[PDB]
Structure formats: structure tokens, C-alpha cells
């Protein structure tokens, strides 16, 4: 008993199914009329030494499709499914293969042309422009990003100088998190001017070369 | 410095580009370019000729796709407006844009204050104010040898 266990009833009962190849337009109409359950009729005719398969589309849906059978002995095909309840199963083995083709040929090439034209619509091509574009680099007093950045800088204001005791408390609070820190990161952590911070740090901490990607300060006072 | 140097070169070449146009192509703001501009003049001990209304008519009218006769009329209107002192203290760009608006509205190719303002780099209010000052004297500003698609007496009043 496992999620991957497959219900092999399809194989055990030897359920046989037919794999049929049909055009996209045909199956698209069947999917559209799926709610009707009257997409068409499938006719099979067998003779003394010949058999044929064909499908007739419903008049309302259309507003004969002979089928050509293909060998299934050259490769063993099987049908399996996965249930939404996380239960896999094997429906059966493919016992016959067929492919749908239209009965007519000359007028059918018209439909293919229409499908090609519809399929050509998304193929974007360079458009010729009669007049030069005069809206590029339109005169502007100051760029959008600059006034926004300036507003943030001026609204937040510069970093103030906290009292020496609070700066030391923050530094030791950072030391509990990590032994050493890069000055750029320490400035952001302590939120103090780089000059003011360095003056307080140099009195206790020191800077030493380490294998880390950037020069780091050592916070141990001794 | 490079942005301000580019403005000075255009002025020296007789093809002035407004600070808004130089700012539109540079990351530097108009204000900073303006500050560097005066500093360079002192540093170089040089000076540049005063801008005039006719220095922008060719570029603005062409960017607006205005006909040749409309550009000529706008040039005459702007030049005569300065000579008549109808626009005291007004920036030449504002006067040029207002003259272009007047000539355009008088022609078949009519352009809105926003369209002219966007290309000339002037606020519609500034254009409207400059236009309101010159509108009463419009028949004197237009050339005598000009073809009116819309008569001067029917020009927009505001």
C-alpha cells in the first residue's frame, strides 16, 4: 500500500482500447460541443478481406472522415491514468491504432490555408513608420527617479549621532550576533555616521585581514 | 560638467538646446546643469550669446510637423512680440511656444497647448499666460504676406 501503487485492473481484465489520431480542429469542435454529447458518430465496416473506419461530424457542429488503421505490433502501447485522489491506474492496452483524414482533398487545402492565416496573426513583423518619433527624450526639468530618490533622502534625512553609551550598547548587541563584521554592514546595523562609528570602534575594536570577502573589524575589546 | 559643457557648445554653435532638453538626455537635473553652467563660464572666462526666439522655431516646428509657412509665421510673431516688448521678462522658450500655438491655431495644422508644451518643454499655464499677453496684438504680430487658414479675428480668446 503506497501512493505510487497502480490499479492494474485494466491489464488484469485485458481491457482493450483504440488509439485514434485526429486533427486539432476536429477535436477542438468535440471539446466545444463536449457538453452536448452529440459530436458525431463513428462507423466501422468490415468485409471479406478489408475493413474501414470513419467518423461523421454532426451537421450543427460542422456548420465524412475516413480513418486509416495502423499496425500496433511494432510497439506495445498502454493507457494509464492518475486520479485526483492520488491513485494511479492502468486503463488498458492499445489493441488498434487509426488516424483521421478528410474525405475531400482540394477544398481541404482551403481550410489549411485559413488555419495558416490564423496561425500567422501572432507572427509580429517590423512596422514601417511614416513619421519620425518626436516624443523620445522629451524635455524634462528633473527625472522621475531623481525627484523620488531626493525626496526619500530628504524626508528620511541624514543619520544622526547617538550617544556614546547607546553606540557601544548597539555594537555589543551586534557582537552577540557575530564576532566580526564588515564596516559597511556595521554602519547599517548601528545606524551611525561612518566617521563617528569608526572613532568609537577604534577605541575598542580593531580591523584585521581575514579570509572573508571583505575587510572586517574585530569587536573584541581585548 | 559634461552635460553643462554640451549646453555651452550648442549655444556657441548657434543652435541652443534648452536646459530641459539637455536634462532629458542626461542623468543630471536641470538645476545641477544650471549650476555647472555658470561655474564653467567663470572657469573659462568666456560667455555665450543670448538666446533668441528664432533659435528654437526650426526644431520645435519640425518636431510638431508644422508646415513651412506656419514656422515662418511663428518666427515673425515671436520676433515682433519681442520687438514690441509685449512679453517683458518672459522666457524666449515660453514666447516661442506661445507664438507657435498662435500660428498653429491660425493654420490648418492645429496643435494643443499640451502637445506644444511637451515638445517645447513649457507648462501649458506658462504658454497660456504668454499667449494671453500676445493675443490682443495678434494682427500686428502676424506677417503681412501670410496666408490665414483661420482668420486672426477668429483665433481662440482666453
Curated annotation (Swiss-Prot), chain A:
Give all N6-acetyllysine modified positions.
21, 32, 121
Report any one BP term from Gene Ontology: transcription by RNA polymerase II
Q: What is its main location?
A: nucleus
Assembly: Heterodimer of an alpha and a beta subunit. Interacts with HTATSF1 and GPBP1. Interacts with URI1. Interacts with GTF2B (via N-terminus); this interaction is inhibited in presence of GTF2F1.
This entry carries the following GO cellular component terms, namely:
microtubule cytoskeleton; nucleoplasm; nucleus; transcription factor TFIIF complex
The gene from which this protein is expressed is: GTF2F2
Instruction: Family membership, please give it.
Output: Belongs to the TFIIF beta subunit family.
Q: Which residues carry this modification: Phosphoserine?
A: 126
What protein name does the entry list? General transcription factor IIF subunit 2
Q: Which InterPro entries match?
A: TFIIF_beta (IPR003196), TFIIF_beta_HTH (IPR040450), TFIIF_beta_N (IPR040504), TFIIF_interaction (IPR011039), WH-like_DNA-bd_sf (IPR036388), WH_DNA-bd_sf (IPR036390)
Species of origin reads: Homo sapiens (Human)
Q: Which cysteines are joined by disulfide bonds?
A: none
Sample GO molecular function, one term: RNA polymerase II general transcription initiation factor activity
Please indicate if the UniProt record lists Phosphoprotein as a keyword.
yes
From Swiss-Prot, chain B:
EC main class here is transferase
- Residues binding DNA are 31, 38, 90, 114, 123, 126, 128, 132
Effect listed in the UniProt record for changing residue 128 to E: Inhibits interaction with RNA polymerase II
User: Which is a Gene Ontology cellular component entry for this protein?
Assistant: nuclear body
Reported effect, residue 80 to A: Abolishes autoacetylation, represses transcription activity, does not inhibit its association with chromatin to promoter-specific regions and decreases the association of GTF2F1 with chromatin to promoter-specific regions
Concerning PTM, the database record says: Acetylated. Autoacetylated; autoacetylation at Lys-80 stimulates transcription activation.
Region annotated Core promoter DNA-binding sits at: 31-35, 91-94, 125-128
Summed up, the tissue specificity of this protein is: Expressed in the inner cell mass forming the embryoblast. Not detected in cells from the outer thin layer trophoblast (at protein level).
E.C. numbers: 2.3.1.48
**Any Gene Ontology biological process:** transcription initiation at RNA polymerase II promoter
| Domain of life of the source | Eukaryota
Q: Name one GO molecular function term.
A: RNA polymerase II general transcription initiation factor activity
Q: Which residues carry this modification: N6-acetyllysine?
A: 80
The annotated consequence of residue 128 to A reads: Reduces DNA-binding
Main localization, broad class = nucleus
| Phenotype when changing residue 27 to L | Reduces interaction with VP16
On whether Acetylation is a keyword of this UniProt record, the answer is yes
Localisation: Nucleus; Chromosome
sequence repeat locations: 60-136
Q: Which residues form a coiled coil?
A: none
Please write the reaction equations for the catalytic activity of this protein.
L-lysyl-[protein] + acetyl-CoA = N(6)-acetyl-L-lysyl-[protein] + CoA + H(+)
Relate the assembly described in the record: Found in a ternary complex with TATA box-bound TBP. Part of a TFIID-containing RNA polymerase II pre-initiation complex (PIC) that is composed of TBP and at least GTF2A1, GTF2A2, GTF2E1, GTF2E2, GTF2F1, GTF2H2, GTF2H3, GTF2H4, GTF2H5, GTF2B, TCEA1, ERCC2, ERCC3, TAF1, TAF2, TAF3, TAF4, TAF5, TAF6, TAF7, TAF8, TAF9, TAF10, TAF11, TAF12 and TAF13. Associates with TFIID-TFIIA (DA complex) to form TFIID-TFIIA-TFIIB (DAB complex), which is then recognized by RNA polymerase II (Pol II). Found in a RNA polymerase II initiation complex. (Microbial infection) Interacts with HIV-1 Vpr.
Role according to the record: General transcription factor that plays a role in transcription initiation by RNA polymerase II (Pol II). Involved in the pre-initiation complex (PIC) formation and Pol II recruitment at promoter DNA. Together with the TATA box-bound TBP forms the core initiation complex and provides a bridge between TBP and the Pol II-TFIIF complex. Released from the PIC early following the onset of transcription during the initiation and elongation transition and reassociates with TBP during the next transcription cycle. Associates with chromatin to core promoter-specific regions.
Q: Regarding domains, what does the record say?
A: The TFIIB-type zinc-binding domain is necessary for the interaction and recruitment of RNA polymerase II to the core promoter, the formation of a fully competent pre-initiation complex (PIC) assembly and basal transcription initiation. The C-terminus is necessary and sufficient for interaction with the TATA box-bound TBP complex and for the formation of PIC.
Family according to the record:
Belongs to the TFIIB family.
Q: Quote the protein name from its UniProt record.
A: Transcription initiation factor IIB
Native source species: Homo sapiens (Human)
Q: Which residues of the full protein are shown?
A: 159 to 316 of 316
